[PDB]
Design a protein around this ligand. Structure first.
Ligand SMILES: O=c1cc(CP(=O)(O)O)c2ccc(Br)cc2n1CC1CCCC1
Length: 269
């Protein structure tokens, strides 16, 4: 609740050094204690929607047996920049399960767009988020246009608090059936793109699943994670940044430092 104040001045100093805005929401699932800094502001999702995309695919797999094993074929024209798995299987195709793992663990853009098409596009993923009680999340566009991160534009945004609340529901709550919940957790744990973000703030003997996002403009980048500290209940957190100038650079170091301050606020140093 009021752990925010153990670290509200440290967050203001971090954001001043960064030269932009940092949004943080962290929840101790044991006590319900929370740390919030700009937790209600909108930040561009960038690639961070791909974790929710995989969760929506897993949800649909509860109603559509065989969905995950469905082979998907795609042409050269489906490849977009940063498609490091899907480019290796262009001549063969991949299963829905494989595309979901590529979208989560490599942030694969072709895979993301192919899975968006299966769900009925950005409105389809937005519908899934509404179905679990998230009224903040909006996806509007596809890869790569959703990365514009225009100041003041609500398109393709959510808030750190809504991302944390939704992540808790999907990974630890009852939004997915048990097998689907563990598959989502296992994809997040195998992510390869987040070593310099939240993961950099967590001890090596704690389990962590995360999903990154990097727009590449307006100092805009983010990460959300579930962390299993030993001997206590899991922590769910979201760290989002943006900056006023198109040329402003994101900082992975600032996201790690924000994650450290959120864990210090919850008393999990
Ligand atoms: O779509 C992505 C995906 C990633 C990996 P994540 O978003 O951090 O999960 C990414 C990473 C660093 C940076 Br700079 C930019 C990125 N873009 C936008 C680019 C503009 C053309 C090429 C893709």
């Amino acid at each position: 609740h009021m752990l925010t104040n153990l670290v509200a001045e440290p967050f203001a100093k971090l954001e001043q050094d960064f030269g932009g805005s940092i949004g943080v929401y962290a929840m101790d699932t044991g006590s319900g204690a929370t740390v919030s800094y700009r937790a209600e502001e909108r930040f561009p999702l960038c690639s961070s929607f791909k974790g929710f995309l995989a969760a929506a695919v897993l949800a649909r797999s509860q109603q559509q047996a065989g969905l995950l094993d469905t082979p998907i074929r795609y042409g050269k024209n489906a490849l977009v920049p940063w498609s490091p798995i899907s480019e290796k299987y262009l001549t063969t195709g991949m299963t829905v399960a494989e595309l979901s793992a590529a979208a989560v663990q490599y942030s694969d853009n072709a895979a993301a767009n192919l899975l968006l098409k299966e769900l009925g596009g950005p409105a389809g993923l937005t519908a899934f988020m509404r179905s679990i009680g998230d009224t903040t999340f909006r996806l509007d566009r596809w890869e790569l246009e959703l990365n514009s991160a225009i100041p003041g534009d609500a398109r393709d945004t959510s808030s750190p608090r809504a991302v944390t609340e939704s992540l808790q529901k999907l990974t630890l709550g009852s939004a997915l059936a048990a097998p689907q919940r563990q598959q989502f957790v296992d994809w997040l744990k195998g992510n390869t793109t987040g070593n310099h973000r939240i993961r950099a703030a967590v001890p090596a003997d704690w389990a962590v699943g995360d999903k990154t996002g990097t727009c590449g403009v307006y100092g805009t980048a983010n990460d959300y994670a579930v962390v299993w500290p030993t001997g206590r209940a899991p922590i769910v957190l979201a760290v989002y940044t943006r900056a006023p100038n198109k040329d402003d650079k994101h900082s992975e170091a600032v996201i790690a430092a924000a994650a450290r301050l959120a864990l210090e606020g919850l008393g999990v140093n």
